[PDB]
Design an enzyme around this catalytic site. Sequence first.
Site, PDB file in Angstrom:
ATOM      1  N   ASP A 136       0.836  -1.192   0.000  1.00 49.89           N
ATOM      2  CA  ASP A 136       0.000   0.000   0.000  1.00 49.89           C
ATOM      3  C   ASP A 136       0.875   1.247   0.000  1.00 49.89           C
ATOM      4  OD1 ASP A 136      -2.156   1.689   0.074  1.00 49.89           O
ATOM      5  OD2 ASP A 136      -2.793   1.148   2.103  1.00 49.89           O
ATOM      6  N   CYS A 188      -8.100  -1.704  -4.939  1.00 46.51           N
ATOM      7  CA  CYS A 188      -7.098  -1.872  -3.899  1.00 46.51           C
ATOM      8  C   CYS A 188      -7.806  -1.646  -2.570  1.00 46.51           C
ATOM      9  CB  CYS A 188      -5.926  -0.912  -4.105  1.00 46.51           C
ATOM     10  SG  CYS A 188      -6.405   0.712  -4.731  1.00 46.51           S
ATOM     11  N   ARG A 219      -3.134   2.000  -6.086  1.00 45.23           N
ATOM     12  CA  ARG A 219      -2.691   0.864  -6.886  1.00 45.23           C
ATOM     13  C   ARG A 219      -3.637   0.614  -8.056  1.00 45.23           C
ATOM     14  NH1 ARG A 219      -1.807  -2.751  -1.497  1.00 45.23           N
ATOM     15  NH2 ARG A 219      -3.370  -1.232  -0.786  1.00 45.23           N
ATOM     16  N   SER A 220      -4.943   0.792  -7.839  1.00 45.69           N
ATOM     17  CA  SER A 220      -5.908   0.598  -8.917  1.00 45.69           C
ATOM     18  C   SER A 220      -5.656   1.568 -10.063  1.00 45.69           C
ATOM     19  CB  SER A 220      -7.332   0.760  -8.386  1.00 45.69           C
ATOM     20  OG  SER A 220      -7.644  -0.251  -7.447  1.00 45.69           O
ATOM     21  N   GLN A 231      -1.419   7.523  -6.361  1.00 45.67           N
ATOM     22  CA  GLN A 231      -1.377   8.257  -5.105  1.00 45.67           C
ATOM     23  C   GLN A 231      -0.001   8.785  -4.717  1.00 45.67           C
ATOM     24  OE1 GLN A 231      -3.778   9.038  -2.142  1.00 45.67           O
ATOM     25  NE2 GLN A 231      -4.504   9.545  -4.205  1.00 45.67           N
TER      26      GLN A 231
HETATM   27  O1  LIG Z   1      -4.855   0.866  -1.784  1.00 47.03           O
HETATM   28  C1  LIG Z   1      -4.344   1.833  -2.416  1.00 47.03           C
HETATM   29  O2  LIG Z   1      -3.458   1.652  -3.287  1.00 47.03           O
HETATM   30  C2  LIG Z   1      -4.815   3.234  -2.076  1.00 47.03           C
HETATM   31  O3  LIG Z   1      -5.110   4.018  -2.909  1.00 47.03           O
HETATM   32  N1  LIG Z   1      -4.887   3.518  -0.665  1.00 47.03           N
HETATM   33  C3  LIG Z   1      -5.300   4.753  -0.051  1.00 47.03           C
HETATM   34  S1  LIG Z   1      -5.664   6.126  -0.696  1.00 47.03           S
HETATM   35  C4  LIG Z   1      -6.030   7.066   0.508  1.00 47.03           C
HETATM   36  C5  LIG Z   1      -5.895   6.328   1.741  1.00 47.03           C
HETATM   37  C6  LIG Z   1      -5.430   4.849   1.380  1.00 47.03           C
HETATM   38  C7  LIG Z   1      -5.156   3.711   2.358  1.00 47.03           C
HETATM   39  O4  LIG Z   1      -5.142   2.525   1.941  1.00 47.03           O
HETATM   40  O5  LIG Z   1      -4.938   3.956   3.572  1.00 47.03           O
HETATM   41  C8  LIG Z   1      -6.191   6.986   3.057  1.00 47.03           C
HETATM   42  C9  LIG Z   1      -6.857   8.332   3.056  1.00 47.03           C
HETATM   43  N2  LIG Z   1      -6.507   9.199   1.894  1.00 47.03           N
HETATM   44  C10 LIG Z   1      -6.467   8.536   0.587  1.00 47.03           C
END
Ligand SMILES: O=C(O)C(=O)Nc1sc2c(c1C(=O)O)CCNC2
EC number: 3.1.3.48
Length: 295
Positions: free
Chosen positions: A180, A214, A220-221, A261
């Site tokens: 992640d 994800c 990741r998506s 992200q």
């Molecule tokens: O799983 C991913 O690749 C992903 O985008 N994760 C994200 S995006 C995102 C969070 C998370 C997380 O998993 O904590 C937390 C709050 N802000 C945006």
Amino acid sequence: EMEKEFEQIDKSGSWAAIYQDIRHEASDFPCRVAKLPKNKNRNRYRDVSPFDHSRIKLHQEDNDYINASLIKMEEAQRSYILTQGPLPNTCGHFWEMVWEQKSRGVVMLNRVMEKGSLKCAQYWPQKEEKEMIFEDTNLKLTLISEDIKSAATVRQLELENLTTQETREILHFHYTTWPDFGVPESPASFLNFLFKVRESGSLSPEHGPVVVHCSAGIGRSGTFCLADTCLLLMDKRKDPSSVDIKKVLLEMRKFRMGLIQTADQLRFSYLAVIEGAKFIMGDSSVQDQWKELSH
Ligand SMILES: O=C(O)C(=O)Nc1sc2c(c1C(=O)O)CCNC2
Ligand SMILES: [Cl-]
Ligand SMILES: [Cl-]
Ligand SMILES: [Cl-]
Ligand SMILES: [Cl-]
């Protein structure tokens, strides 16, 4: 070329600046349905919502909301549904969406537990003899078979509409080695997984859109879908130079916020498309290479 822009950005350490420019120029559309108080427990993250104009609607008159977005890539002629990792109360909604949208494949890029936290509910059965029945949406889900490898696991599932007794085979592609907020272990590993999804026929327009998730359905998506679309656009024109990754990512972000992200995820998606380009342009021996160092 992608490759020369990559070298220029790397030589100048501009990835964080390039990535922030994409965040600044990204589309901003309302998410009023997602923010309704009746939908608070249907959202995993308060800063991750689907736009109203592209959200998937469940075909129930009760509450049609699921945190899921239809990415319709007009020129590439490929659609994806990007959604969050289902919550304990949204697993029935998740499989209802799979049924109603006639999806053939589900792509999972996360683990259930990551960094000591539960980033996704256990929404599929782990044992053949212990099927799952989602009573709220009247669906039955049965593990048919499971093929586990070092980087990925492919499962065959049977989804049955208990109302009509129709059954469908769903293919579950689970990439298990993608941290992640991180990147896959190598481009070769990522591309080996991507082409497994491709070869399955789950991306065919004869099916509904593939469901990709994800934990939040953006990081990741978004990396996974950006690389697939860019490789597909290269494929249609057989012309790597006609593909502008930053513009494709901005086009995708019209349909769901925050796709990709981190700046390193953007950098990796360049690497995946550049390396995957060798296959698109007619060097199929790069495929067994990927499988060779996918170990
Ligand atoms: O799983 C991913 O690749 C992903 O985008 N994760 C994200 S995006 C995102 C969070 C998370 C997380 O998993 O904590 C937390 C709050 N802000 C945006
Ligand atoms: Cl809004
Ligand atoms: Cl898992
Ligand atoms: Cl952990
Ligand atoms: Cl959960």
